[PDB]
Amino acid sequence: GVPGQVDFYARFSPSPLSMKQFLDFGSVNACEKTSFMFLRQELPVRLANIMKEISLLPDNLLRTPSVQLVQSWYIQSLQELLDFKDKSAEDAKAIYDFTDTVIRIRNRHNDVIPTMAQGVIEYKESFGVDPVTSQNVQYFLDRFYMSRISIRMLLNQHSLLFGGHIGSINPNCNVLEVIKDGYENARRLCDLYYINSPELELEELNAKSPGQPIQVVYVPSHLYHMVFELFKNAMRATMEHHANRGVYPPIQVHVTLGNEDLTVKMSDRGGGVPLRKIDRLFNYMYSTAPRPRVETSRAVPLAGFGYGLPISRLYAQYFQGDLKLYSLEGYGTDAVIYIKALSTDSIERLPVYNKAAWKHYNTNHEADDWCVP
Amino acid sequence: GVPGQVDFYARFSPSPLSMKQFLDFGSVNACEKTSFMFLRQELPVRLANIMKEISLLPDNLLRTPSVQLVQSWYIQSLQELLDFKDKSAEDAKAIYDFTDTVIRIRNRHNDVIPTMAQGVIEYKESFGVDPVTSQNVQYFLDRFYMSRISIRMLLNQHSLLFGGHIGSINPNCNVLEVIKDGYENARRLCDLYYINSPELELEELNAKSPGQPIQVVYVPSHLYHMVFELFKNAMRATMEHHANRGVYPPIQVHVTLGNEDLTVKMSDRGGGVPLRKIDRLFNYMYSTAPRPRVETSRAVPLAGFGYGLPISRLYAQYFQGDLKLYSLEGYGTDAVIYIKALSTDSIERLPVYNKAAWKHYNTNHEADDWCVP
Ligand SMILES: Cc1cnc(Cl)nc1-c1ccc(N(Cc2ccc(CNC(=O)C(F)F)cc2)C(=O)c2ccc(O)cc2O)cc1
Ligand SMILES: Cc1cnc(Cl)nc1-c1ccc(N(Cc2ccc(CNC(=O)C(F)F)cc2)C(=O)c2ccc(O)cc2O)cc1
Ligand SMILES: Cc1cnc(Cl)nc1-c1ccc(N(Cc2ccc(CNC(=O)C(F)F)cc2)C(=O)c2ccc(O)cc2O)cc1
Ligand SMILES: Cc1cnc(Cl)nc1-c1ccc(N(Cc2ccc(CNC(=O)C(F)F)cc2)C(=O)c2ccc(O)cc2O)cc1
Ligand SMILES: [K+]
Ligand SMILES: [K+]
């Protein structure tokens, strides 16, 4: 039945695309039939691969109402896509119906990330963090959210190209404009909560072509989400660390375009965090708190906004970038986004379900070749 | 014979000590008999554990004359220490002879690190980098050099305490003075090679106790070696990146003492390195070059000095610190030393030979749970 369908498509590996391919495959003669032939296999493959790992979750997380809802959305979308596997690519009605289905799935899966996050809240509310399976939850969520980002990318591209900027990709994404947009939105929320906010000091270096505007091929909303998250963190740190003084140091952002890397470095004077404690910030169980209640006029704390640091790092890593933190405890913190400057180096990073993935859920990863202390 | 002796002591695990224990065990009533009872077991254990891994090296590396020499030094030292296993701790002559043996071994093992490094040079000269075993060489060298650092620490402590500052530990190591010493020695060599050098801009924050000198319990030479390495790197980068202009930006160092971390951050404007290429800098095969020839009056390139980046990071990690690089390609690089501010958190990080270690030499570590591209 459904287990048989999931098993069939989970045998296959997802096929990673580059940003250059996304761009090229949807510009001149963007071909809906070609997208159909690809996506009627690729979407079931990507859904089925991650659905196998949902099934490996600790029972107390798997059974939460929010996870059950996400799983039922994936099951229903898988079945609806599989209705097309035996249609002909020259059947115009089948092509039109497939695009309608993609658009429908795109809307249905619109709040997958907040709903999975609420399952994690339900889980640690009703049972706590079982330490034995907590490595499994961390491993799963990195892969589920990356999978979701990759599925959203395909749904967006097909819906935007054929539901009637290349799709959601801007071939000339203006990096500094996105950064200023992130700063202004974060500052607005900072002002509401702290009644003040740090100024922005922005510096840029186009090493590739000095003095020229810094542009890359990118999905602007991905960059926005990452820079918003980092501004929010640096503002919370600055405003709370210097609350007694009432004088708030600026947040400095340094943007550099090198031969290979676009780098966005954000520096604050928020007092920092010791190295021992920094990796908790990328842990889902540690970083998920119940969302603020609706029924209040009081300003929402900054922690109540954004995708969070782990998902932000996944956005960077999705196209072979990264997001790294390094702090000087007592002084402040540097946060750095790395993005590939070239669209041909920007290849999807996708999880795959196989024996190695399954073994991860059933092994303990203890570095016994070094002394414990 | 010797295999039987190595096998016997390699069954045991090394016993990590904290800096606070090193300090306390050698101050009031520093007891030579107590050190003897500990070290006549601990030194054979640490030697035997790493000797088992020497034996796992690729034959073409193991058979180099330099590795054979290091191995013969370890074999001879192991046997000489084992002569004491059945002596009585109340035999004053045995105690005196043991201290003499420790002092002798300390001198004999004095150039273990340069000799092992020359074996690596011989290896990649005569056969190249066999890609199948190159993961093994990297794994081994991290562990061999850390082991050597730990054995040197024990030999130094016993020799300095009983061969007649607590041993080699300064309970009040003046961090900024060591940093300036590293800068001045690096600058001297930079001037000789480039006929100019960057200035030092030094800033400090004692968050723990503002305005007070920054001091920690530490081994000053370990800190010196790390900061020298980083100065040398930042000077090479600055002088070569700005050679055309003839104006050289300073190297900025920011020292912070937090509740938990002593941090030393070194920033340069040397043009940086892309993220994809930064990890090669910690790879022994990549970072080992033949040493400069003696028979020349020409200034020695900066790369010919120091322990190198991998060993420098091992020095940081030896007492639960770290050494991290983050670069903005096109602009410059930040290098950060992390040191535990408290002697009780500074616990030896020691490799141990067991089934997990052996499996590392006989497995391939391929992240098959993610798509390759
Ligand atoms: C055209 C289109 C529009 N919108 C979307 Cl979301 N996707 C597409 C699309 C993307 C890839 C393909 N693939 C699938 C595909 C999959 C992977 C790759 C490269 N990556 C790998 O091989 C991976 F396995 F490592 C390239 C192409 C093709 O084989 C293909 C590409 C161009 C073309 O003119 C005709 C085609 O049939 C087809 C359609
Ligand atoms: C993870 C997170 C999520 N949402 C929000 Cl609003 N803030 C955080 C968060 C922000 C800053 C930090 N800290 C540590 C920290 C924690 C609390 C404070 C405020 N408290 C005080 O200083 C006062 F208690 F002394 C300051 C700094 C950093 O140094 C830091 C981390 C990431 C980053 O991108 C930028 C950063 O500055 C930790 C968590
Ligand atoms: C006194 C001395 C001088 N110089 C040197 Cl290099 N070492 C020593 C020395 C260090 C430790 C010990 N150990 C060995 C030892 C080993 C490990 C630890 C802590 N670490 C662990 O247990 C490790 F396994 F995790 C503590 C002590 C003791 O058991 C010991 C300590 C103090 C004392 O007054 C009497 C003693 O017999 C003995 C001598
Ligand atoms: C690893 C190493 C060993 N010994 C010596 Cl003398 N230098 C190096 C080395 C130094 C700097 C780098 N680069 C990259 C690099 C390489 C060459 C140059 C010089 N060449 C040019 O800029 C010119 F070609 F354009 C500059 C920067 C850095 O950005 C960097 C790395 C570590 C560090 O602690 C500090 C750093 O600045 C790489 C290797
Ligand atoms: K699969
Ligand atoms: K052992």
Short mmCIF file of N, CA and C and ligand atoms in Angstrom, two decimals, chain A residues 373, chain B residues 14-18 21-22 25-26 30-31 34-39 153-155 157-158 161-162, ligand 3:
data_model
loop_
_atom_site.label_atom_id
_atom_site.label_comp_id
_atom_site.label_asym_id
_atom_site.label_seq_id
_atom_site.Cartn_x
_atom_site.Cartn_y
_atom_site.Cartn_z
N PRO A 373 38.04 12.15 29.77
CA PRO A 373 38.14 13.48 30.40
C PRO A 373 38.42 14.64 29.45
N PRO B 14 46.09 5.46 28.94
CA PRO B 14 46.73 6.62 29.57
C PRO B 14 45.79 7.28 30.57
N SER B 15 46.37 7.89 31.61
CA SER B 15 45.59 8.54 32.66
C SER B 15 45.74 10.05 32.54
N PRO B 16 44.74 10.77 32.03
CA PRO B 16 44.89 12.23 31.85
C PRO B 16 44.91 12.96 33.18
N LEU B 17 45.79 13.96 33.29
CA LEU B 17 45.88 14.81 34.47
C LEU B 17 45.36 16.21 34.15
N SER B 18 44.94 16.93 35.18
CA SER B 18 44.62 18.32 34.93
C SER B 18 45.82 19.19 35.25
N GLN B 21 46.22 19.56 38.83
CA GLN B 21 46.91 18.44 39.47
C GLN B 21 48.42 18.52 39.26
N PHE B 22 48.86 18.80 38.03
CA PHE B 22 50.28 19.02 37.79
C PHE B 22 50.82 20.06 38.76
N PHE B 25 50.54 18.71 42.53
CA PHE B 25 51.38 17.56 42.82
C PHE B 25 52.87 17.89 42.76
N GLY B 26 53.24 19.14 42.49
CA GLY B 26 54.64 19.49 42.45
C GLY B 26 55.00 20.79 43.16
N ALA B 30 56.47 18.22 47.12
CA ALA B 30 56.59 17.55 45.84
C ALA B 30 57.38 16.26 46.04
N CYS B 31 56.73 15.12 45.85
CA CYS B 31 57.26 13.86 46.35
C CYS B 31 57.79 13.01 45.20
N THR B 34 56.43 9.42 45.05
CA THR B 34 55.09 9.38 44.48
C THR B 34 55.13 9.50 42.97
N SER B 35 55.95 10.42 42.45
CA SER B 35 56.10 10.53 41.01
C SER B 35 56.65 9.24 40.40
N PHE B 36 57.59 8.61 41.09
CA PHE B 36 58.16 7.35 40.60
C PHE B 36 57.09 6.27 40.48
N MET B 37 56.30 6.08 41.54
CA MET B 37 55.26 5.06 41.51
C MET B 37 54.26 5.31 40.38
N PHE B 38 53.94 6.58 40.12
CA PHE B 38 53.06 6.90 39.00
C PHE B 38 53.76 6.70 37.66
N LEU B 39 54.92 7.34 37.48
CA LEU B 39 55.52 7.36 36.15
C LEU B 39 56.12 6.02 35.75
N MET B 153 55.48 16.50 28.44
CA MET B 153 54.98 17.18 29.63
C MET B 153 55.37 16.43 30.90
N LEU B 154 55.17 15.11 30.91
CA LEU B 154 55.53 14.31 32.09
C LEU B 154 57.04 14.30 32.32
N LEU B 155 57.83 14.12 31.25
CA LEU B 155 59.28 14.10 31.38
C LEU B 155 59.80 15.43 31.90
N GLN B 157 58.09 17.75 33.68
CA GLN B 157 57.69 17.97 35.07
C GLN B 157 58.59 17.21 36.03
N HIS B 158 58.81 15.92 35.77
CA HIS B 158 59.62 15.15 36.71
C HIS B 158 61.07 15.62 36.71
N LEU B 161 61.22 19.08 38.49
CA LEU B 161 60.93 19.02 39.92
C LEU B 161 62.04 18.33 40.70
N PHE B 162 62.63 17.28 40.13
CA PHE B 162 63.49 16.39 40.90
C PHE B 162 64.92 16.28 40.38
C1 LIG C 3 53.84 14.01 42.18
C2 LIG C 3 54.09 14.04 40.69
C3 LIG C 3 55.15 14.78 40.16
N1 LIG C 3 55.45 14.86 38.86
C4 LIG C 3 54.63 14.16 38.09
CL1 LIG C 3 54.98 14.23 36.38
N2 LIG C 3 53.60 13.41 38.42
C5 LIG C 3 53.32 13.35 39.74
C6 LIG C 3 52.15 12.49 40.08
C7 LIG C 3 50.93 12.67 39.42
C8 LIG C 3 49.84 11.87 39.71
C9 LIG C 3 49.94 10.86 40.66
N3 LIG C 3 48.82 10.00 40.91
C10 LIG C 3 48.21 9.35 39.75
C11 LIG C 3 46.95 10.03 39.27
C12 LIG C 3 46.40 9.71 38.04
C13 LIG C 3 45.25 10.33 37.60
C14 LIG C 3 44.61 11.28 38.38
C15 LIG C 3 43.34 11.95 37.89
N4 LIG C 3 42.97 11.50 36.56
C16 LIG C 3 42.38 10.32 36.33
O1 LIG C 3 41.96 9.60 37.24
C17 LIG C 3 42.29 9.85 34.83
F1 LIG C 3 42.34 8.49 34.79
F2 LIG C 3 41.10 10.22 34.32
C18 LIG C 3 45.16 11.60 39.61
C19 LIG C 3 46.31 10.98 40.05
C20 LIG C 3 48.33 9.71 42.15
O2 LIG C 3 47.58 8.76 42.31
C21 LIG C 3 48.64 10.59 43.32
C22 LIG C 3 48.39 11.96 43.27
C23 LIG C 3 48.63 12.77 44.37
C24 LIG C 3 49.11 12.22 45.54
O3 LIG C 3 49.36 13.01 46.63
C25 LIG C 3 49.35 10.85 45.63
C26 LIG C 3 49.11 10.04 44.53
O4 LIG C 3 49.35 8.71 44.66
C27 LIG C 3 51.16 10.64 41.29
C28 LIG C 3 52.24 11.44 40.99
#
